[PDB]
Design an enzyme around this catalytic site. Structure first.
Site, PDB file in Angstrom:
ATOM      1  N   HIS A  92       0.873  -1.258   0.000  1.00 34.39           N
ATOM      2  CA  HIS A  92       0.000   0.000   0.000  1.00 34.39           C
ATOM      3  C   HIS A  92       0.852   1.229   0.000  1.00 34.39           C
ATOM      4  O   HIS A  92       0.455   2.275   0.601  1.00 34.39           O
ATOM      5  CB  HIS A  92      -1.032  -0.033   1.214  1.00 34.39           C
ATOM      6  N   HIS A 111      -3.194   0.562  12.013  1.00 30.71           N
ATOM      7  CA  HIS A 111      -2.827  -0.829  12.345  1.00 30.71           C
ATOM      8  C   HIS A 111      -4.124  -1.427  12.912  1.00 30.71           C
ATOM      9  O   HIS A 111      -4.712  -0.886  13.854  1.00 30.71           O
ATOM     10  CB  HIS A 111      -1.693  -0.816  13.331  1.00 30.71           C
ATOM     11  N   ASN A 141     -10.022  -3.070   2.851  1.00 29.31           N
ATOM     12  CA  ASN A 141      -9.820  -2.970   1.380  1.00 29.31           C
ATOM     13  C   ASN A 141     -11.149  -2.806   0.660  1.00 29.31           C
ATOM     14  O   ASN A 141     -12.216  -2.680   1.279  1.00 29.31           O
ATOM     15  CB  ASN A 141      -9.176  -4.277   0.871  1.00 29.31           C
TER      16      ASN A 141
HETATM   17  C1  HEM Z   1      -7.657  -8.637   5.222  1.00 26.61           C
HETATM   18  C2  HEM Z   1      -6.391  -8.628   4.853  1.00 26.61           C
HETATM   19  C3  HEM Z   1      -5.715  -7.297   4.837  1.00 26.61           C
HETATM   20  C4  HEM Z   1      -6.244  -6.025   4.594  1.00 26.61           C
HETATM   21  C5  HEM Z   1      -7.639  -5.500   4.379  1.00 26.61           C
HETATM   22  C6  HEM Z   1      -5.049  -5.136   4.698  1.00 26.61           C
HETATM   23  C7  HEM Z   1      -5.175  -3.731   4.517  1.00 26.61           C
HETATM   24  C8  HEM Z   1      -4.056  -2.852   4.543  1.00 26.61           C
HETATM   25  C9  HEM Z   1      -4.147  -1.449   4.243  1.00 26.61           C
HETATM   26  C10 HEM Z   1      -5.374  -0.775   3.830  1.00 26.61           C
HETATM   27  C11 HEM Z   1      -2.836  -0.929   4.406  1.00 26.61           C
HETATM   28  C12 HEM Z   1      -2.424   0.520   4.226  1.00 26.61           C
HETATM   29  C13 HEM Z   1      -2.718   1.438   5.500  1.00 26.61           C
HETATM   30  C14 HEM Z   1      -2.300   2.830   5.036  1.00 26.61           C
HETATM   31  O1  HEM Z   1      -2.982   3.457   4.230  1.00 26.61           O
HETATM   32  O2  HEM Z   1      -1.214   3.230   5.529  1.00 26.61           O
HETATM   33  C15 HEM Z   1      -1.997  -2.028   4.873  1.00 26.61           C
HETATM   34  C16 HEM Z   1      -0.633  -1.954   5.161  1.00 26.61           C
HETATM   35  C17 HEM Z   1       0.221  -2.996   5.630  1.00 26.61           C
HETATM   36  N1  HEM Z   1      -0.261  -4.297   5.705  1.00 26.61           N
HETATM   37 FE1  HEM Z   1      -2.138  -5.013   5.613  1.00 26.61          FE
HETATM   38  N2  HEM Z   1      -3.931  -5.855   5.032  1.00 26.61           N
HETATM   39  C18 HEM Z   1      -4.293  -7.203   5.029  1.00 26.61           C
HETATM   40  C19 HEM Z   1      -3.394  -8.220   5.364  1.00 26.61           C
HETATM   41  C20 HEM Z   1      -2.124  -8.126   5.800  1.00 26.61           C
HETATM   42  C21 HEM Z   1      -1.339  -9.195   6.353  1.00 26.61           C
HETATM   43  C22 HEM Z   1      -1.814 -10.658   6.438  1.00 26.61           C
HETATM   44  C23 HEM Z   1      -0.096  -8.668   6.798  1.00 26.61           C
HETATM   45  C24 HEM Z   1       1.088  -9.272   7.448  1.00 26.61           C
HETATM   46  C25 HEM Z   1       0.903 -10.389   8.228  1.00 26.61           C
HETATM   47  C26 HEM Z   1      -0.159  -7.239   6.410  1.00 26.61           C
HETATM   48  C27 HEM Z   1       0.898  -6.332   6.579  1.00 26.61           C
HETATM   49  C28 HEM Z   1       0.827  -4.937   6.204  1.00 26.61           C
HETATM   50  C29 HEM Z   1       2.012  -4.091   6.299  1.00 26.61           C
HETATM   51  C30 HEM Z   1       3.396  -4.554   6.708  1.00 26.61           C
HETATM   52  C31 HEM Z   1       1.586  -2.784   5.962  1.00 26.61           C
HETATM   53  C32 HEM Z   1       2.310  -1.467   5.894  1.00 26.61           C
HETATM   54  C33 HEM Z   1       1.880  -0.795   7.222  1.00 26.61           C
HETATM   55  C34 HEM Z   1       2.674   0.464   7.432  1.00 26.61           C
HETATM   56  O3  HEM Z   1       3.845   0.593   7.017  1.00 26.61           O
HETATM   57  O4  HEM Z   1       2.226   1.357   8.160  1.00 26.61           O
HETATM   58  N3  HEM Z   1      -1.377  -6.887   5.821  1.00 26.61           N
HETATM   59  N4  HEM Z   1      -2.742  -3.227   4.874  1.00 26.61           N
END
Ligand code: HEM
Ligand code: HEM
Lengths: 726, 726
Positions: free
Chosen positions: B101, B365, B174
């Site tokens: 993202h 988060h 999402n």
């Molecule tokens: C339902 C499944 C998931 C959805 C809806 C989702 C949604 C998102 C969204 C919307 C962002 C961006 C937030 C922003 O705008 O800064 C994000 C970032 C992130 N996601 Fe998730 N995610 C999913 C699953 C996962 C999983 C399974 C992991 C790791 C186990 C993960 C790790 C991350 C990481 C590392 C970031 C970057 C966060 C940051 O640097 O601040 N995501 N995700």
């Protein structure tokens, strides 16, 4: 075993044309291609086949599909150390991108000089024609982020790391011979102006926005490199088909201590060639990785990028003999005044294995010189020398970035520096200071001398007071833009006018457009009037009366500043689209492929679906892409062989493919009944220069097409393209 | 006095339509739009006007144009601490982008519930319809870098930080109701497979490459979210016209301790709308910032993005009553089985001041919940809980990222955590531990209770052995893909088939394409045949005989899964291109512009150059952009008023404008002699549905156009477009 039984998952480890095999890491594609630096990285290459999957601590993993949980529908447990290591490493993958030139593409190769240069320089890598120096080269845009597109309008970077026997030399240049600004103090101002604006972070990869043109209108020293940017130099066809320049005057120092001023040049042996703007802009959408891809696939095909290193040499006593300051990096040295002397050749012949480890983590810095080179007081170079070490410790996580494998010297390095984050070297020296007696003062300083000596700066005389002041000799801003303008062909001039017109149309505050047109009137009234007409602006009588700037040391033009005025075309490594039908005339395809192969030109076979088609003789033709999947933007010419033309005659995408290629000035060749497509692009029966046509695709047809391809585009068509709706 | 004397450099601080004024920092464009979070940021907002330029240590600078040198053509001196501070800051501007993202666009706003939800949750922000919660929302793509393009085919993120009185709640969702994978252990595998491939770092912003489809073909759990990505859900028209979903089942906990399962939804009050693929891919070249731009300019116009929060609620006793597991994030809960209950409304009404400070450094988060919410054992959610804090401390430089102003709570926060990089808060507590007597144990724990209580987890029973094992209840992969497919309109199904066909055409290893088509044959044979036909692949008799998966709880469709099966169009905030000529019929333009204004539809007046044109009656019409400058890609409909049509009739750009808009199914309206453009797009003399045409723009002409615009695109035109060369 999940691989296919036929072995078709693995690309052949031999040279193959673009699209014929999946691309691969360099050591697996070309395992016999070696140089001293490539070999030196073997300590850290990691294979995979036949090895067990483990944690980073070496523990074998049994189930890499599931987290540990209390029951198979239960909560995940904190004791899952295998999940937590895998997810922690993923969480920490990204490092800061480069502040500028974040978008770039790199390859390994080697350099050697044509003859010894010991009469003008004691640099060891220029001393012997048979002493080969490995290199790593990164090409780049400037403004956009690492995930921006390649075929934007921008300056391009051309950085070469030479792994010499007397140290690393980094020649950190761009594809135009001057920069936008005079003093490094202004670099953050200029970069902030060109970069996305700070409230909304728009636009990416584009100078076509208010703050860039505001800065330009208020800093006329920028106009010279703006002219280069707005010309087709801003939109190269390939990093193989652009020039490179060090920009600054540097010094060469020979063994008797003589200093010669030098500017550095790279000449592309594939020739100079650029896109046209509508093609470049559309290509940022259809393939934002076009230059990265084309470079990697040229090296996998054996179309190695080659460049000739060249020096403009000016004796010390001629420092002040020009009408511009040699130390002003907004001024170029015309080749009609000081010719480029050929120095040696660089060949890029292997791609990296891992883009992050080798390209992203590479660190080039123009203060990394070696004995036999030195700096000058150019005030933009001077300030560069502070920034590259400073930013590379921020980006690469500390002061041992020279121990990241791609950046390591291949020659010895020993000193008393210690510690820092991620220190790899384990020093056994009892001493970490000098002078010391406890290690008999080793490692020891080395006096300067003819070869293998320590570095000593050339003892330039410095006389002046401590001032923050611009040299009055730098205060002339319009003569070099004018010389560049007058050296372009008429079509190149039209493309410059169109580039300023398109960009300033995207400036929302109209007064900035007006101020830029006023600057243009100080360069050339014909340029300024043509931009003003496209903007709806009328020059005032005072503007019409501005006296043009003086010639540059009597020159009214210098054709070395044009991409096209002097023919230098090379078709090897270019690509043609061949638009198939479901009953292709095999005899045409034979003649076409034979003539292309003789000149090293590649082909992509396109159709209206994937899979195969069969020719009139039973030959099964695999399809590389659909007409929409690999648009004309991606090729240099288009050939339509005969066959069952009714199959594709009414296909919108096949017709559009010819209309787009026609608008973008590409050669088109139509055999037999494919001539029915002349009607889509309005070609009269008598034919037109740049459309090749015959009853069949034979010797003569292919020679005419290849001659058009050697001239790159069909400039004479330009008046015919404004009426085509494409 | 570098500003123009007319003051035209500064945008009016009032709502203005897109393009009418330069865009600006939110607090300058809309100073009177306030909320508690925006007010709380005043302590760190920095102005500029009337202030002296200084170093960061407050020393006034006299000459910000030059480095300090010994003589005005001499070397730069190390003592120049003004240059060094300015270039050091520039050298360290970048921070790592988000691992996923990385490309996103954000705004401020507020949320209010429609009624108190105290019966089902004790969350304080849902307790009172008069309680307003500030929010900050970031919308994103997934795969590309921060400098990648907006209108790629990808899933979109929709993250909302609620600044509640009892803590920050981040709802990190999402734009589709499921994810690709079931267990977080696989998230680095899946992300590595969709991200640019590791040898060469291609392709950016695209899943159309071999590793993605390799992973999908070997992990059929991914097929449900792949279906959504290949549909037009993958290419939204705007972040305003997509849905949002939390994906996981979470819990609501009320004051009595009762847990209810919940899945979260956001409904776009502007409706659901998407592009078509050739338009989205082209738009990534013509304007890679299109979604960021559109969101920012909607807010500056007053077209505030509004979304309704909604809950699907399932009682605890009903956990096992569906054919799928509620804890499986690859499964949706059909709205025909569990309706979405409306909960409240979120309005985004102010852009940031500084994109880096507020958008780039924001940290969302999904572990940030508040009392009244809780988690479930969904094994994807459980692993996310580890990732977000871990990655944000790497990205944002240490463990005090909650002290970066955008991430600060508006409510009180006090604990015994100390130190860490970048520590802002200066703690005066004598104690940094509890229990303590030296500060009478403050700050103190708080028991759980109905309001303002401490957090306590719901006491779910856990029973099972420690296992790395997927629940058998999750081992079904094709029924929800089929439910999705059967719920789409015929034109939506065509666009799904074309999405898979285009993407697998870019997979170089044909066996991967064959393996994906074998998976489609397990979902729906019509889908699999149509994709195979485009790939030149013939299904085997075995594939033709695979039995379809079961219906989901008896459903053979659910229309809430389609973008378009149930009309929800809203034209406010949409935009029309008006193609001018040099003597426009002014009566047509009066009628067109006021009709659009009455329905809140914007207009862009286009011509062949910038400046002005004059209407039949003397009205001076200012031009917003050229035809090439603002392509049809960027608008929702095109109107051509009557006048001197011969001026533009042979302009290839004007013609192509209408051909591209026609191909992309946009409404087109032609008044008077503009009907001569019918021949360019091949419209019968008798006309066709989707083309509005009359003798003038009066009477019903604008109502007919607006009706077309409320239906978004002219789907009936699809069979008419394959033939069009555009
Ligand atoms: C339902 C499944 C998931 C959805 C809806 C989702 C949604 C998102 C969204 C919307 C962002 C961006 C937030 C922003 O705008 O800064 C994000 C970032 C992130 N996601 Fe998730 N995610 C999913 C699953 C996962 C999983 C399974 C992991 C790791 C186990 C993960 C790790 C991350 C990481 C590392 C970031 C970057 C966060 C940051 O640097 O601040 N995501 N995700
Ligand atoms: C003649 C003018 C200049 C030329 C030809 C030049 C060329 C380049 C090139 C080609 C790169 C990318 C090297 C790579 O591929 O990694 C680069 C990076 C950079 N340049 Fe320069 N540049 C110039 C002026 C400056 C100035 C005046 C400054 C600041 C005083 C500067 C600061 C930087 C920084 C901070 C980087 C990022 C380096 C890194 O992170 O490793 N540049 N420049």
């Amino acid at each position: 075993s999940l691989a296919p039984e036929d072995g078709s998952h693995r690309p052949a480890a031999e040279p193959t044309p673009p699209g014929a095999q999946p691309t691969a890491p360099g050591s697996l594609k070309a395992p016999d291609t070696r140089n001293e630096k490539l070999n030196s990285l073997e300590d850290v290459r990691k294979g995979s086949e036949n090895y067990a999957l483990t944690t980073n601590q070496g523990v074998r993993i049994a189930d890499d599909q599931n987290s540990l949980r209390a029951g198979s529908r239960g909560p995940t447990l904190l004791e899952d150390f295998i999940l937590r290591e895998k997810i922690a490493h993923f969480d920490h993958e990204r490092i800061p991108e480069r502040i500028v030139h974040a978008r770039g593409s790199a390859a390994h190769g080697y350099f050697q000089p044509y003859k010894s240069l010991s009469d003008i320089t004691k640099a060891d890598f220029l001393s012997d024609p048979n002493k080969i120096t490995p290199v790593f080269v990164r090409f780049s845009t400037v403004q956009g982020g690492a995930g921006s597109a390649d075929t934007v309008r921008d300056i391009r970077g051309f950085a070469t790391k030479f792994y010499t026997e007397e140290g690393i030399f980094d020649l950190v240049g761009n594809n135009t011979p001057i920069f936008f600004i005079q003093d490094a103090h202004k670099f953050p101002d200029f970069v902030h102006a060109v970069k996305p604006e700070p409230h909304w972070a728009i636009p990416q990869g584009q100078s076509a926005h208010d703050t860039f043109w505001d800065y330009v209108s208020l800093q006329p020293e920028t106009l010279h490199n703006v002219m280069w940017a707005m010309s087709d130099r801003g939109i190269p066809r390939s990093y193989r088909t652009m020039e490179g320049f060090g920009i600054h005057t540097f010094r060469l120092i020979n063994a008797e201590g003589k200093a010669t001023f030098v500017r550095f040049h790279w000449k592309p042996l594939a020739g100079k060639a650029s896109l046209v703007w509508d093609e470049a802009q559309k290509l940022t959408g259809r393939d934002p990785d076009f230059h990265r891809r084309e470079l990697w696939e040229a090296i996998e095909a054996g179309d190695f990028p080659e460049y000739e290193l060249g020096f403009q040499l000016i004796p010390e006593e001629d420092e002040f003999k020009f009408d511009f300051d040699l130390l002003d990096p907004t001024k170029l040295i015309p080749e009609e005044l000081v010719p480029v002397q050929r120095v040696g050749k660089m060949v890029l012949n292997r791609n990296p294995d891992n883009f992050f480890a080798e390209n992203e983590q590479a660190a080039f810095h123009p203060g990394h010189i070696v004995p036999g080179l030195d700096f000058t007081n150019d005030p933009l170079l001077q300030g560069r020398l502070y920034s590259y070490t400073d930013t590379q410790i921020s980006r690469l996580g500390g002061p041992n970035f020279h121990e990241i494998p791609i950046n390591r010297p291949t020659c010895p390095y020993h000193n008393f520096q210690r510690d820092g984050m991620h220190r790899m070297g384990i020093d056994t020296n009892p001493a970490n200071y000098e002078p010391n007696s406890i290690n008999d003062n080793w490692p020891r300083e080395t006096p300067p001398g003819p070869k293998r000596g320590g570095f000593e700066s050339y003892q330039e005389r410095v006389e002046g007071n401590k001032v923050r002041e611009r040299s009055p000799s730098f205060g002339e801003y319009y003569s070099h833009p004018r010389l560049f303008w007058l050296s372009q062909t008429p079509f190149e001039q039209r493309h410059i006018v169109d580039g300023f017109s398109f960009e300033l149309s995207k400036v929302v505050r109209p007064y900035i457009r007006e101020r830029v047109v006023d600057q243009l009137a100080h360069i050339d009234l014909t340029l300024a009037q043509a931009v003003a007409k496209n903007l709806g602006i009328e020059l005032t009588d005072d503007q019409l009366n501005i006296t043009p700037p003086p010639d540059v040391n009597g020159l009214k033009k210098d054709p070395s500043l044009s991409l096209y005025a002097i023919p230098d075309g090379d078709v090897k490594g270019r690509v043609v689209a061949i638009l198939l039908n479901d009953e292709v005339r095999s005899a045409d395809l034979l003649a076409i492929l034979k003539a292309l192969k003789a000149k090293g030109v590649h082909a992509k076979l396109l159709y209206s679906r994937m899979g195969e088609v069969t020719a009139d003789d039973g030959t099964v033709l695999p399809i590389a892409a659909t007409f929409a999947g690999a648009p004309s933007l991606t090729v240099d010419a288009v050939i339509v062989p005969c066959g069952n033309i009714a199959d594709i005659a009414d296909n919108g995408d096949a017709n559009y493919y010819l209309m787009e290629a026609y608008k973008h000035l590409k050669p088109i060749a139509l055999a037999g009944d494919a001539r029915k497509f002349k009607a889509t692009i309005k070609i009269a029966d008598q034919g037109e220069e740049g459309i090749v046509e015959a009853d069949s695709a034979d010797g003569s047809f292919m020679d005419e097409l290849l001659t058009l391809m050697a001239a790159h585009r069909v400039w004479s068509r330009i008046p015919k393209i404004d009426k085509i709706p494409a």
